[PDB]
Amino acid sequence: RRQLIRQLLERDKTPLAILFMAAVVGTLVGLAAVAFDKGVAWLQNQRMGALVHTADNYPLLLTVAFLCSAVLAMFGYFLVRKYAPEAGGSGIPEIEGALEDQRPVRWWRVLPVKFFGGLGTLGGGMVLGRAGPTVQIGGNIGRMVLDIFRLKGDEARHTLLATGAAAGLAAAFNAPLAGILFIIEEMRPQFRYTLISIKAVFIGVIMSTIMYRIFNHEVALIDVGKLSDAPLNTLWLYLILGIIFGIFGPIFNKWVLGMQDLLHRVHGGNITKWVLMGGAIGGLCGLLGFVAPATSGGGFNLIPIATAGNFSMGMLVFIFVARVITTLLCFSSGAPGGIFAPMLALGTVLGTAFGMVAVELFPQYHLEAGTFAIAGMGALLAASIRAPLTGIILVLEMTDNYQLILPMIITGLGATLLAQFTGGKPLYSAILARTLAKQEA
Amino acid sequence: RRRQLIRQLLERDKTPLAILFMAAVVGTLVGLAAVAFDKGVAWLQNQRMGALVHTADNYPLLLTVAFLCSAVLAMFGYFLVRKYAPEAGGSGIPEIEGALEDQRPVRWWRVLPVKFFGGLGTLGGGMVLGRAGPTVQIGGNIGRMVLDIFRLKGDEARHTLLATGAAAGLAAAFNAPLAGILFIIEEMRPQFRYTLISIKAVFIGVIMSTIMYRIFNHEVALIDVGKLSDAPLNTLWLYLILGIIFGIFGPIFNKWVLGMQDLLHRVHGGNITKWVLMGGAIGGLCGLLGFVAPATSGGGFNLIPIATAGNFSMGMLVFIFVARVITTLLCFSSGAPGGIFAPMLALGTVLGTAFGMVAVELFPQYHLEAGTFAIAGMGALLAASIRAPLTGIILVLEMTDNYQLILPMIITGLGATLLAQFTGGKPLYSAILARTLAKQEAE
C-alpha cells in the first residue's frame, strides 16, 4: 500500500527522451506509410494504362493483366523468402510477438522487404491490406530509432515499438484513435504488465496522422454519407447480425489457418515453387481485377457502393463468396500484406446483405440497409481478430455515422461474444502461437 | 516463458459466462440508477424555480427562498455523508479507483443511499458539481452489490463487475458508451500492475446502461453544438498553443482544489455540524448565484452551446471562467457529495472559446470560428487536471459529433497532458486517492 501511495504520486512521468523520440518515430512512420500508399496506387495505375495500350485484343489484354500482376506478385514472395521471412503475411502477429520479446525486429531487413514486397503484392492488385504492412514497418521504424539513438531500458524498447505500430495503422486509415486503441486492446502484452506510455503513443500517432494529412487531405478512403438513425425497436436486428458474424468468424479463422497449411504443401518450403505459386495467385488477382474488379484488390471501392444499397442481392452474395476465396488465397499464401482491411469489405458486404432482408421483412422499421453495412463493417474484425473496441472505433473514424454507435457496438459484442462461445480464437494470437510452436519444435 | 505464452495466447479472451451475464445485470441497474439520479436532480432544480415564481415580486424575499432552498438541500447532502458514508463525499472516482486497488471498501449498503440521496441534494440544490463521480461510484457499488448477492468468487469477477459498474456508470451520465469503456482502461484500472478485467464484459455492461438511458432520454442531446467548420493544416499549430495554455493551468488548478480542501477543513475541523452548516452556506450561495448570475452556478452544460456558438462577449467569457473557477473550488473542495469531472467541461469550453476569440481577430487569413477552439478546449482540463486525455477527447467526440476536429482535439489534449506533466503536476484523482490512503496511516 505505501508502495501505491508512492506510485500514485509518481504517475504519468514519461521520460522526456522517450517522448521526443516518439515524435520522430511517428513522423518517419507517417512519411513511410504515405510513401507505401502512393507506391501501391502508382503500380495499380500502370497496370490500368497497360490494359489501355492493348484494349482491343481481348485474349492479349487478359494476358498482360495476368503477367503484370503475376510478375509483381513474384517480386514480393521472392523479396520475403530470400531476405526477411518474418515479413510474410500480416506482420501484426510478428510485432505482437516483438512486444512480448519473443520475436526479433530485424529492421535493416524488414523495412526494405515489407515496403518493396508490399509494393508488389498490393500494387499487383492482390487481396491484401496495407495495415499489417504499415504496422510492421512502423514497429521496425520505431525499433530502428531505438537502436540508432541507443536508448536503453525496457520502457523505451516497449514504448517506441508500440508507438510505431499505432502510428502505422493510424497512417494507413486516417484513424488516429483506432491506432491508439489497437495497441491497448490487442497489440500490447495481453497477459502481463508492461511499461508502455499511452501519452507517448499518442504523440506518435499525431505526427503520423499529420504526415498523412499533408499528402492526402480533402479526400477520404471511404465516404458513405450520413445514414438514418436507428430506432430502439430496431436494435435487436443488430444483435442477430452480430451473432451471424460470431459463428462465421471462427469458421473463417480455421480456413485462413488451414489454407496456410494447404498452400504450404504446394511448395514444401521451396523459394522457387513458392514464388512461382505466388505469381499465379498474384496473376489471377490482376486478371480478376479486370473481368470482375470487386472480387479482387483492396475492396475499399465497393464498401460505399454496397452501403448505398447499389448492389443486387445476388451481386452481394457473389462478392462475398468470391472474396472469401481470394482473401484466403492471398493471405494464407505467405505473400506480404494483411487480412485486417480485406475484412472490412467482407463485413460491409455481409451486413448489407442482412440489411436487404430486414428492409422487406420489416417495412414498419423504415430501414436503410446501409446501416447494417456500417454495423457489419468491423464485425469480422470483432469475430476473427477479436478486437471489437478497435473495430468499432476504426469504422467510426472512417464513416462518421456516430448515430450508429449503438448498432455498431451491439453487433460488435454480438460477434466477440458468439466467437468465444463457438470456440474461435484471436487470429493474430493464433498466428503468433502457430509461429512460436514451430519455433520450439 | 515461450511455452507459457503459446498456451496463454491460445486461451485468450475466454471470459467466464457467469461474469458475462452478471455484467449485463450490473449494466442494467447502473443505467436505471443513473437515469433516476438525473431525473431526480432535474425535478428538484425545477421545484426550486417554481418557488421563485411563487414569490416573483418581493425581490429580497425571492433572493431568500432562492438561498434557503439550495442551503437546505446542500445540508441534507453533507449530512447524509458525514453521518452514514464519509467515502461518499467528493467525486467518488478516487474511491472506486481505490476499490480496484483493493485498498478501499465498497460499502454498498451505505453509499448507494448516501451518494444517491446526498448528491440529489447538492446537485439538485444547483451547486456546481458533476453527475459523473456520483454515478461512477453509485455504479461501482451497484456492481459490488451484485457480486455479494450472487456470491461470485474470484478476482476477475470482483474487479470486472467493479470496473463494469463504473464504466456503465459514466456512460449513462453522458450518453457516452466509448468514453465510459475507455475511462476504465485509461484511468480507472490499476496503473502499476496487471489485472484480469474482461473488456468484453465491461462492454456488455456499458451497452445495457446506455440502452437504459436511451429508453428515458431519447431524442434530446446533453449538448447540441451542430456541425462546425473544419481545421486547415496551417491552423493546427494554434491548437498546440492552447494545449500548452491548459497544460500550465492544469496543475495550477489542481493545487487550488487540494489546498482548498485544507482551507475548508479548518472551518469545521472535522465537526459534523460546523461542516453541514458550512455546506448549507455554500449551497445557498449557489442557489442565489443560480438566480442572479446563472452561468456562475450549476453544472454548466447550458452555457456550453452558447460559448461554442460565439454568443458570449469576451467580457462574459472572462467573468464566467473566473467565477466558475471560484465556485467550482468552493463546491468540490468542500467535500459535498459530487464530482469535478463535468464542470471541467464548461471551464474548458469557455477557456477554449476565449482563445478562439483572440485567435479569430488575430488571424483572419485563417477564417476561424471561435467554436472550434471551444470544442478543442472542452476535454482539455480533463487532460491537464485529470491526465486522462484519451477519455476526454473521445468523450467530447461522443458528446459533440464534430469528428472533423479530431486532430485539433487530440493536439490540444496532448498539449495539455505534456505541459501538465512538465510543469510538475499530477493526476487529480490519483492525488486524492493518495491523500486519503496516506491519511489512513497518519492516524
Question: What would you say this structure looks like, in words?
Answer:
Two copies of one chain form a homodimer. The first copy, chain A, is mainly alpha-helical and 441 residues long. Chain A has a single domain (1-441), classed as Clc chloride channel. Chain A contains 19 helices and no strands. At the A-B interface, α1, α8, α9, α17 and α18 of A face α1, α8, α9, α17 and α18 of B.
Summarize the structure.
The structure is a homodimer. With 441 residues, chain A is an all-alpha fold. Chain A has helices at 2-8, 16-53, 58-83, 92-100, 107-123, 131-148, 154-173, 176-187, 198-216, 236-267, 271-291, 302-307, 313-331, 340-361, 369-376, 379-385, 388-399, 405-421, 427-437.
Percent strand of chain A: under 5%
CATH topology of chain A: Clc chloride channel
User: Biggest interface: chains and residue counts?
Assistant: A-B, 67 and 65 residues
Shape estimate of chain A = globular
Oligomeric status of the shown chains?
homodimer
Domain count of chain A: 1
Intramembrane segments (chain B): 93-100, 161-173, 177-185, 371-385, 386-388, 389-400, 401-405
Site (Mediates proton transfer from the outer aqueous phase to the interior of the protein) (chain B): 132
Keywords (chain B): Antiport, Cell inner membrane, Cell membrane, Chloride, Ion transport, Membrane, Stress response, Transmembrane, Transmembrane helix, Transport
GO molecular function (chain B): chloride:proton antiporter activity; identical protein binding; voltage-gated chloride channel activity
